[PDB]
């Protein structure tokens, strides 16, 4: 696990949910898209969104 | 908080 910077996207690959990261103290040439149970919470992304 | 994740 690594230091997550921001979360900068988010897409749904056949059903699965997967959000677009950057890492803390890594470029973004390193930036990786990440299924959601990869994240501690990602409840707080569908959150954030879903409330709009 | 800081938050951290598994990277593929």
């Known amino acids: 696990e690594f230091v997550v910077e921001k979360v900068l996207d988010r897409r749904v690959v056949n059903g699965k949910v997967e959000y677009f990261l950057k890492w803390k103290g890594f470029t973004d040439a390193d930036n990786t898209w990440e299924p959601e149970e990869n994240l501690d919470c990602p409840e707080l992304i569908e959150a954030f969104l879903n409330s709009q | ?8």
Request: glycine content about 0%; aromatic content about 0%.
């Open chain 2, 1 to 8: 908080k800081v938050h951290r994740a598994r990277k593929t």
